[PDB]
Amino acid sequence: VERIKTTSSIEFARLQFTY
Amino acid sequence: WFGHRYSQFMGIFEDRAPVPFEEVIDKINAKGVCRSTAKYVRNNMETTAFHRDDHETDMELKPAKVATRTSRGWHTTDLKYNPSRVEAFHRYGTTVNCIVEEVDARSVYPYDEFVLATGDFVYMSPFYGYREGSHTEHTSYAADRFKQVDGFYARDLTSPTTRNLLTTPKFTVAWDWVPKRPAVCTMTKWQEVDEMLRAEYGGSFRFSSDAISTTFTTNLTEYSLSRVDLGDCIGRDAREAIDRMFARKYNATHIKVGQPQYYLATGGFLIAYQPLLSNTLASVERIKTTSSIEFARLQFTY
Amino acid sequence: WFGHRYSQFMGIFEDRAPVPFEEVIDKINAKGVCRSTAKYVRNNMETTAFHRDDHETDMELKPAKVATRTSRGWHTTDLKYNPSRVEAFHRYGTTVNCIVEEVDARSVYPYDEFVLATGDFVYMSPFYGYREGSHTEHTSYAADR
Amino acid sequence: EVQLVESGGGLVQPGGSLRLSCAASGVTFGSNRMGWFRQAPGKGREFVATHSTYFNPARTNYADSVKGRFTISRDNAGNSVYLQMNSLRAEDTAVYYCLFDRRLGTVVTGPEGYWGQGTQVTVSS
Amino acid sequence: EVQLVESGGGLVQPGGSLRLSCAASGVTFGSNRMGWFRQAPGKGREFVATHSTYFNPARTNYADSVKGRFTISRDNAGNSVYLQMNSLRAEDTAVYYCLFDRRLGTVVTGPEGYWGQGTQVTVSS
Amino acid sequence: VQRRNQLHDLRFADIDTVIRA
Numbered sequence: 001v002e003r004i005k006t007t008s009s010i011e012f013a014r015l016q017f018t019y
Numbered sequence: 020w021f022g023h024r025y026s027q028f029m030g031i032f033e034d035r036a037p038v039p040f041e042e043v044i045d046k047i048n049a050k051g052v053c054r055s056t057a058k059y060v061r062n063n064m065e066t067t068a069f070h071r072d073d074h075e076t077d078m079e080l081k082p083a084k085v086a087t088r089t090s091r092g093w094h095t096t097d098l099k100y101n102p103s104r105v106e107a108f109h110r111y112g113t114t115v116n117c118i119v120e121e122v123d124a125r126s127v128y129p130y131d132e133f134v135l136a137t138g139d140f141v142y143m144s145p146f147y148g149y150r151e152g153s154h155t156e157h158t159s160y161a162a163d164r165f166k167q168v169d170g171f172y173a174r175d176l177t178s179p180t181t182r183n184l185l186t187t188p189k190f191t192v193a194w195d196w197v198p199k200r201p202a203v204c205t206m207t208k209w210q211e212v213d214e215m216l217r218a219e220y221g222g223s224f225r226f227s228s229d230a231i232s233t234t235f236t237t238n239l240t241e242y243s244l245s246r247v248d249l250g251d252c253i254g255r256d257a258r259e260a261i262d263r264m265f266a267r268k269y270n271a272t273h274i275k276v277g278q279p280q281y282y283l284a285t286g287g288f289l290i291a292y293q294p295l296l297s298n299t300l301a302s303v304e305r306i307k308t309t310s311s312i313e314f315a316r317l318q319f320t321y
Numbered sequence: 322w323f324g325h326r327y328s329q330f331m332g333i334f335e336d337r338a339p340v341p342f343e344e345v346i347d348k349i350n351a352k353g354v355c356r357s358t359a360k361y362v363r364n365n366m367e368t369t370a371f372h373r374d375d376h377e378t379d380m381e382l383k384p385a386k387v388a389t390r391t392s393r394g395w396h397t398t399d400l401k402y403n404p405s406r407v408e409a410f411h412r413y414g415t416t417v418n419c420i421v422e423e424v425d426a427r428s429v430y431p432y433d434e435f436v437l438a439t440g441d442f443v444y445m446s447p448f449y450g451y452r453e454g455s456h457t458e459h460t461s462y463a464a465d466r
Numbered sequence: 467e468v469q470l471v472e473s474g475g476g477l478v479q480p481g482g483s484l485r486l487s488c489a490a491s492g493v494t495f496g497s498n499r500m501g502w503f504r505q506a507p508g509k510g511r512e513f514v515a516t517h518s519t520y521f522n523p524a525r526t527n528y529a530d531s532v533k534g535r536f537t538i539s540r541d542n543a544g545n546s547v548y549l550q551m552n553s554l555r556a557e558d559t560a561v562y563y564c565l566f567d568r569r570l571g572t573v574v575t576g577p578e579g580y581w582g583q584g585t586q587v588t589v590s591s
Numbered sequence: 592e593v594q595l596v597e598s599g600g601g602l603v604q605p606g607g608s609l610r611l612s613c614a615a616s617g618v619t620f621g622s623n624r625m626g627w628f629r630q631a632p633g634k635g636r637e638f639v640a641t642h643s644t645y646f647n648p649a650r651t652n653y654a655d656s657v658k659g660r661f662t663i664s665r666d667n668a669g670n671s672v673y674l675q676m677n678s679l680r681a682e683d684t685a686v687y688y689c690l691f692d693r694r695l696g697t698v699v700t701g702p703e704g705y706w707g708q709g710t711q712v713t714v715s716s
Numbered sequence: 717v718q719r720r721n722q723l724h725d726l727r728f729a730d731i732d733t734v735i736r737a
Binding site: 387396 | 727728730733735
């Protein structure tokens with residue numbers, strides 16, 4: 001059992017959406 | 020103060036006394052013991068304290084009680100000594116606890132001072148010493164407070180080190196002297212790009228990475244690494260990563276062309292670039308870096 | 322405490338005493354000197370300390386020892402005074418060091434208090450005063466302060 | 467970096483006396499070890515004496531052979547070490563080397579230390 | 592923001608006595624200077640006296656002419672300043688102005704200070 | 717704040733002088 005680590009930057013996914 | 024049927028602390032004077040170089044060498048490192056006495060200079064006065072107000076003895080250093088997420092520690096006494104009860108008298112009691120603590124030490128540029136995990140500041144360069152120009156590093160202290168021992172073998176409470184021992188008014192801090200240039204660097208390696216495409220346009224170089232979706236923009240003229248202050252990591256890290264990435268993706272289909280080249284991209288990014296070629300075809304300063312790579316990713320996407 | 326062959330600190334009481342307005346005006350700003358005595362209210366008591374337990378004198382303020390990345394400071398004494406040796410006695414010694422320090426002060430909105438570079442909080446508006454309605458700015462202190 | 471300048475050797479008869487001097491210049495501030503080693507014809511460079519200001523009072527160490535006959539001392543300001551050899555004998559014929567380093571022992575020595583040019587001492591009739 | 596109300600002036604024969612009063616209302620709660628200036632016919636407004644609560648005991652200052660004849664004081668709780676003039680010579684004929692001010696010293700005033708409307712004092716034989 | 721405060725004795729005091737009597 002572990003902890004999920006999250007990036008501080010969502011802009012990669014927003015670039016993905018726009019592209 | 021010992022009243023009738025109660026005792027009360029009139030006062031508790033607490034102080035941290037440094038362990039002198041002589042004790043660190045001849046007692047602690049040699050035998051794992053401390054003196055029960057603390058003789059030290061406080062408030063321009065030589066003060067001597069005796070544990071339990073008794074004669075000076077050698078006391079064994081033993082591991083401190085374990086605490087989670089703390090470094091190793093050792094000490095000699097577990098109890099505070101208070102004077103025995105005599106009614107209607109003020110009495111005094113001395114406790115001396117020799118404490119040895121492994122700690123992390125941290126230093127920021129320009130490395131003229133460092134901190135310990137206890138919050139104490141040492142106003143000396145970590146790279147201060149007598150050899151290889153280290154005597155010009157910053158020291159705030161008098162010469163007698165600093166000691167450097169070559170061929171020093173640490174004994175746990177095989178290989179020798181050069182041991183720096185600095186006596187401050189509150190403690191003695193010891194560490195290993197290393198030359199500054201191989202140790203610190205004002206730049207750090209961020210990305211390894213095994214496929215970076217360079218295009219020349221409009222008097223500018225564009226370095227595009229499809230893997231990280233990033234386009235950097237540099238001038239045509241190379242950036243000489245001599246302009247970087249304490250930038251000796253850049254060349255060595257660049258050469259190993261470049262050769263490792265070459266000996267893994269192009270060792271068969273590509274050849275290196277020339278030696279690695281250096282460029283400064285907008286955003287303050289230092290690019291070390293090895294050009295390849297397909298077989299079928301064949302005042303120093305600190306670079307400031309922006310926290311946002313988003314401009315270059317927008318450049319790539321656009 | 323003075324033992325037969327050693328001296329030991331039984332205790333070291335350390336305190337910071339404010340320099341009164343009249344001394345700032347009449348001595349420090351007028352002559353660059355400080356009184357060797359500290360008379361101030363501590364723990365609801367008026368306490369007076371004499372430097373070296375000696376008579377009051379005017380002592381010149383001199384630049385402090387230089388330190389890198391540090392603002393300007395001045396003081397009057399760099400030695401702590403301790404009582405002379407008398408065997409088998411507890412003895413007391415008083416040191417008074419008048420210190421003047423230029424410091425940076427910072428205040429965040431709504432600017433009802435500010436801090437000094439020493440970590441000391443001042444629980445009053447930087448813009449507190451008597452004019453242009455600044456008397457309605459926050460003060461935690463009595464008027465005489 | 468430390469420069470070492472030796473002086474005061476030469477030829478002497480058995481039972482005589484000889485004072486070697488060694489002046490140290492450069493980065494000599496702080497606690498250090500200054501001493502004398504010697505190299506005999508065909509023999510290795512062995513420890514003779516050391517004077518260490520790492521401790522106060524300073525600690526002096528001697529070889530077994532020279533104990534009681536050789537005395538090592540320093541200048542009032544430090545930075546200079548003197549070896550008074552009295553009651554010299556044939557075993558004392560060697561090139562004596564001045565050492566300035568930052569070590570704590572007697573005999574180990576290392577490449578980071580500083581050696582003098584070497585002063586000849588001959589004992590013969 | 593301070594309002595000043597004077598009182599107690601008028602006609603005097605030489606050698607008489609006159610006690611002017613000045614009550615201060617508004618923002619007066621701190622240490623301050625309250626005093627009297629005067630303007631003679633065809634003369635500038637010159638310092639007469641001041642009473643300063645910046646210091647404890649309070650500091651009183653007088654012009655050279657009025658020393659020993661004029662006394663400046665304050666009521667208990669402050670905010671009112673009194674100028675008791677004895678032995679009024681002919682030089683004392685002027686309009687006296689009450690000043691409430693956050694300054695030190697004697698003669699220097701500023702636009703930030705508060706002046707009263709002015710009380711006439713005439714001394715004629 | 718710590719770096720400033722722990723320079724206090726180096727600025728306004730003497731940490732090396734030892735007075736006897």
